[PDB]
Design an enzyme around this catalytic site. Structure first.
Site, mmCIF file in Angstrom:
data_model
loop_
_atom_site.group_PDB
_atom_site.id
_atom_site.type_symbol
_atom_site.label_atom_id
_atom_site.label_comp_id
_atom_site.label_asym_id
_atom_site.label_seq_id
_atom_site.Cartn_x
_atom_site.Cartn_y
_atom_site.Cartn_z
ATOM 1 C CG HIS B 77 -2.026 -0.908 1.007
ATOM 2 N ND1 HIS B 77 -3.309 -0.871 1.876
ATOM 3 C CD2 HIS B 77 -2.042 -2.187 0.427
ATOM 4 C CE1 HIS B 77 -4.287 -1.894 1.303
ATOM 5 N NE2 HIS B 77 -3.429 -2.505 0.628
ATOM 6 C CG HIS B 244 -3.787 -11.598 -3.242
ATOM 7 N ND1 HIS B 244 -5.097 -11.345 -3.815
ATOM 8 C CD2 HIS B 244 -3.245 -10.527 -2.308
ATOM 9 C CE1 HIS B 244 -5.098 -10.036 -3.346
ATOM 10 N NE2 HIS B 244 -4.276 -9.510 -2.485
#
Ligand code: HEM
Ligand code: HEM
Ligand SMILES: [Cl-]
Ligand SMILES: [Cl-]
Ligand code: NA
Ligand code: NA
Lengths: 713, 713
Positions: B77, B244
């Site tokens: 992020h 992921h």
């Protein structure tokens, strides 16, 4: 574009501490305004301003052929934003040329006055600031029309952006009182720190309180707002009657003709505003306030005609051509000249607020005395005009140029001259060792010097350790200063002083003001030594001791700290969170966020708290100068909760054991909460930061000690 | 407290140009982060970070006993706010720790991650910035879980306040499209310069577009947002499937359990937020996004399981315990480990945006290729992770430390090494005289060098005159660069260069990049001479020429100036007034308001306008370096009105005679309108300012010429 202020409208705003940076300033970092002004040919500027007074420009023709009145109004509004409560506003930074002041309704068409001055500004450049020029213009207007002024000091350096000032909460210009952001409560109590009756006004509403034309009730508003600008009844009468000796108001037609204020005008308007669709939009057709009053038979000449008229006629309420309430002398002859038509004359007229000077009983006594003795009126007005326009300039050491008045005025918080040799570095070392050998503690020494120096505010440059006014009324009795502990420290310092001065030859002596500061420096040095560090705190002698008779006790009241986060002190309960008050104090001390951060963390561990409170004292080595406040505040091993008894006090407990470690206030914990302050705390709390912390601490300490030392500038 | 923003919400905000002042910065004015980091023991930091990965704290227990996943997310992020349109956002300033990004919903519980790092920060102090540490932690997480990274560069200096970034106009977090401030219009067209689908998200909504769980339509949003962050399809698939492969989402209970974001929390929260009332509020009970997905059978170890699962099962839409849309594998066994209970297992699950990688036709081909060739997946992910986290760092000359990859990547806009002696002062004097003798004009020389240097932006440190990319596609063909005029200037310069280089002994030569800049300097010198001033312009050689193959034409497109006020240029009509675009450009060039003011007034009079427009050329001596722009702008003898044909062009006429004097645009006239800009214009417009103007001009010229010169830093 949605901003942080939109998302979190009640977060603390630190940008007020980082204004006036070298980035926004077009002058070089070594530019010294006082040196520039000292070489200005002041007489030559004044000759050009004298010529201007009667040189009308077609885009804003001069009433009666003379801009005197307009320029007097300009200089009074430059000065008249001043509030004694925080020292903010006033003429000293030339803020009238920036938002919001340049666009306040009470400042309508002062944009024209300032534009008239651009050719002279341009000619003299950096040698005369806009700030100085506004006031000098006012003075030259007065002189040109026959009034002798009390004098003039230059030295107001220009600023390059708007100052951050709380002007009130109203969201509508000129909102009448009792709205959802009312600045009034109780029995017409104006909220501190405000000094005007409505948003966008200078002091009062010229039609009367919230537009009610009652001279008697208007007098109450006048007295309250002038007092909040540090003027008593005599000064107030002299200033208002003085000013309204000249010129005229402008209300030739309806106000709906007037367009957008300067900050809302189109780009083509080139910084001007209030463009009017009424006839020519200017001169005989001018609209400014909406009132249409001309006070005297000779509006371009000093006279005693304002009081002749005020007392010589009986007055009748009427309406201007814009519909505003005003007064006329019915069955006076038409003796007042028209501003543009030599064949028209008018009857005397007055504002409601002018009639206050006659129908308030206390004002009437003064006004009668001035009416009967116009020489006393002229003297009072000259003095009050000087005070008005200089009140935020600071110590007389800042006054520049050849017209500075030699008389020392009580309001100036005067400091006596020094006429003897000063202590040298060896003497300072000797005094510091005596101070430490007396038994005075690190805590007593730092607390006392902090209390003396931290009264300074940069808004009007009042306060500071020069003068040793901490030993006098009222400072010696302020709760924040811990009067009994204070009295014992000063008794010990005064014995040391007496001994040292007694042993000198050749006139050398030390002032108590200097020794207070030097004793503080010794305490900081001892604290450093207690932490294992050898440091010398800088010290500059040359402070002098002022007397009680040179100290206006009532005027000092506004410098009392009722909140000082640096001593974890709050005198009572306030609507404003304590952390907002901390940042407000830091701004008045001229501190940046890093400087505020270092200084508070150090003070905590040195024992500066009022009453020896443990709040925020996050160390096991109290009176040693370390970065313990930060390292312990930032330890995630401690969990913080507000107390049951007081939601503004917090307990820090070991997160695993539940054991009580510390207590703090909102002022302490904001450094762990606010994302920008925590980032600064993290610097000083890092393992490599001990030396940085001590060095930055000493520097900001020294900065505070020297805030009022314009004698060394 | 009512502010200037409240009263005049459309006035221009200059405070974005005076950010990052020495006032707000706790480090000394000579602190050099690169030198600090070069002495850090990077290996020792990395050891401590490896240890941290499995050191679980009770206040935020580690999923599967390993914080790696959380830290990977944190680093992605940090980097993932980047927009190629303006270069703003990204990891390079550590802005995640400040508002608003510290409180964006997509950053929920990253406050916990950053707090876990405080002990390490604290240990190493100023030698490792938070900005660098966020990315390093990412890297170490990856390595700890068995993935070999491509490398790491330090050198991101910490900043001390929020950057001014337009993140959109919505007034509600996570507002779905088509609202009153919609960032979307037309056929789902996202407004520039935005790169996320909703306010408070990084790229896309994990449930699908506006919450609709269609993997195919979600792919469209993914491709558009990633492309606006400079990533193509291969990089996008590698980054999402790479990331992921680790960790899990958190949605154990309803979102109404979660409290205030950090900037809204109470003071006792000490900088953390999103406190949850759901069961323990953490660990097995954590709530972050609302989704409850764990992707792989070994969430703490690199594997090839993401693609095995994505293609090995068929997917069924379901709801998490908070009610979010997600997917579960049809008929699968419970093969996924629980994060906290060794006796529980779970069925495979996926986000809508994960299924995009399979059901978008173009993504499916890439995902298949990676599934079948996991070594290709691993290499692409490593590469893409390095790009992601370095994309805003600038030229390779800024990369610090021992882990910097030796491979030069096209996205880095590489500049070749200089391997020959540089020209010296005598050579530069000789080249300047050749340039002036060729017939090139002041206007041609200044315009060219401005065009070459003024592509720099400080947001991502892309652009500038290094490389001579002005001679290559696409810069050579940009309208603002005047392609035909440009081609003829470069032809003349390249002949001068060829002649000079042909005459040299040893390997001395001058690059075209250097010569463009040097020729610009000669034009400023000649302009000064035309005005009667003797001025040497500083020049630092050492730029090199990049090739066409070293210049990604698609990635350069974002640097095209569609608005450049410094050349009075606007490519079309925009929603944003041109003066706001001017300030935005000044910010990207790193200019202060005074520097922007000086630079534009000078450029006007030197003939830098696109197409030789007269707009703002307020002089009768074009190509002479004077302060004429300011003196004539501020002349109250001239009145300004918008033209009939175009309300953004203005005519200046003699106020008495009516005669036309000048024309200008809003960018020209804003300097006469805005009260802070006019204050700066006044300084340069004054009678004592000609020499100051020339000096300040040459300094800001030279600053712009050197903006990308990190080889000299
Ligand atoms: C209660 C205090 C005061 C009130 C309510 C007030 C009110 C006003 C108003 C409404 C105007 C008319 C503006 C216009 O329409 O052009 C004005 C004009 C003026 N005032 Fe005041 N005043 C106050 C005190 C002062 C003081 C302290 C001075 C200076 C010592 C001053 C000097 C002037 C001058 C010279 C003008 C004339 C402007 C011109 O000729 O253009 N006033 N006053
Ligand atoms: C379309 C792009 C993406 C979407 C919509 C997205 C969405 C999400 C969401 C919703 C979470 C759950 C947050 C929580 O509830 O704790 C998350 C977790 C995570 N994402 Fe992404 N993601 C994206 C791309 C990326 C990329 C590019 C990376 C890294 C290369 C990444 C790595 C991670 C990791 C490691 C976690 C696990 C956090 C943990 O274990 O606590 N994701 N993602
Ligand atoms: Cl102020
Ligand atoms: Cl940014
Ligand atoms: Na002030
Ligand atoms: Na950036």
């Amino acid at each position: 574009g949605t901003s942080n202020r939109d998302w979190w409208p009640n977060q603390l705003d630190l940008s007020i501490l980082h204004r006036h940076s070298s980035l926004s300033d077009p002058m070089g970092k070594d530019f010294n305004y006082a040196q520039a002004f000292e070489k200005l040919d002041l007489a030559a500027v004044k000759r050009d301003l004298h010529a201007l007074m009667t040189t009308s420009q077609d885009w804003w023709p001069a009433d009666f052929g003379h801009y005197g009145g307009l320029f007097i109004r300009m200089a009074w509004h430059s000065a008249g934003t001043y509030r004694t409560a925080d020292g903010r506003g006033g003429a000293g930074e030339g803020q009238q040329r920036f938002a919001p002041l340049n666009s306040w309704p009470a400042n309508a068409n002062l944009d024209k006055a300032r534009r008239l001055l651009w050719p002279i500004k341009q000619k003299y450049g950096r040698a005369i600031s806009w700030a100085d020029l506004l006031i000098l213009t006012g003075n030259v207007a007065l002189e040109s029309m026959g009034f002798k002024t009390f004098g003039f000091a230059g030295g107001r350096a220009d600023t390059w952006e708007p100052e951050d000032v709380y002007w009130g909460s109203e969201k509508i210009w000129l909102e009448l009182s009792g709205g959802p952001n009312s600045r009034y409560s109780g029995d017409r109590q104006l909220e501190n720190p405000l000094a005007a009756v409505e948003m966008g006004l200078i002091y009062v509403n010229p039609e009367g309180p919230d537009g009610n034309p009652d001279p008697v009730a208007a007098a109450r508003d006048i007295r309250d707002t002038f007092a909040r600008m540090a003027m008593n009844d005599e000064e107030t009468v002299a200033l208002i009657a003085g000013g309204h000796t000249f010129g005229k108001t402008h209300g030739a037609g309806p106000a709906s003709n007037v367009g957008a204020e300067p900050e809302a005008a189109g780009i083509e308007a080139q910084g001007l505003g209030w463009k009017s669709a009424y006839r020519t939009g200017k001169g005989a057709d001018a609209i400014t306030s909406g009132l249409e009053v001309t006070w005297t038979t000779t509006p371009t000449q000093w006279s005693h005609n304002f009081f002749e008229n005020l007392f010589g006629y009986e007055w009748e309420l009427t309406k201007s051509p814009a519909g505003a309430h005003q007064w006329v002398a019915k069955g006076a002859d038409a003796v007042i000249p028209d501003a543009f038509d030599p064949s028209k004359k008018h009857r005397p007229t007055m504002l409601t607020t002018d009639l206050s000077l006659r129908f308030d009983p206390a004002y009437e006594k003064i006004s009668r005395r001035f009416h009967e003795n116009p020489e006393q009126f002229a003297d009072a007005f000259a003095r009050a005009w000087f005070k008005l326009t200089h009140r935020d300039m600071g110590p007389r050491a800042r006054y520049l140029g050849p017209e500075v008045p030699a008389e020392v005025l009580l309001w100036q918080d005067p400091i006596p001259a020094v006429d003897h040799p000063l202590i040298d570095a060896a003497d300072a070392a000797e005094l510091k060792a005596k101070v430490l050998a007396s038994g005075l503690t690190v805590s007593q020494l730092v607390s006392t010097a902090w209390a003396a120096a931290s009264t300074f505010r940069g808004s009007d440059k009042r306060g500071g350790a020069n003068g040793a006014r901490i030993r006098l009324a009222p400072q010696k009795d302020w709760e924040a200063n811990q009067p009994e502990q204070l009295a014992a420290v000063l008794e010990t310092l005064e014995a040391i002083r007496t001994a040292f001065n007694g042993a000198q030859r050749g006139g050398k002596q030390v002032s108590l003001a200097d020794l207070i500061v030097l004793a503080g420096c010794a305490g900081v040095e001892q604290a450093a030594k207690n932490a294992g560090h050898a440091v010398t705190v800088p010290f500059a002698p040359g402070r002098a001791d002022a007397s009680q008779e040179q100290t206006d006790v009532e005027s000092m009241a506004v410098l009392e700290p009722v909140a000082d986060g640096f001593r974890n002190y709050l005198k009572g309960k306030y609507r404003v969170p304590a952390e907002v008050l901390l940042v407000d104090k830091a701004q008045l001390l001229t501190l940046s966020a890093p400087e505020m951060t270092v200084l508070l963390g150090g003070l905590r561990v040195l024992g500066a708290n009022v009453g020896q409170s443990r709040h925020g004292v996050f160390t096991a080595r109290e009176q040693a100068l370390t970065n313990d406040f930060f390292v312990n505040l930032l330890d995630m091993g401690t969990e913080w909760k507000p107390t049951a008894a007081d939601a503004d006090v917090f307990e820090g407990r070991d997160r695993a054991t539940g054991e009580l470690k510390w207590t703090g206030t909102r002022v302490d914990l904001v450094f762990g909460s606010h994302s920008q302050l925590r980032a600064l705390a993290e610097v000083y709390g890092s393992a490599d930061a001990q030396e940085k912390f001590v060095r930055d601490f000493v520097a900001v300490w020294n900065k505070v000690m020297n805030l009022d030392r314009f004698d060394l500038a």
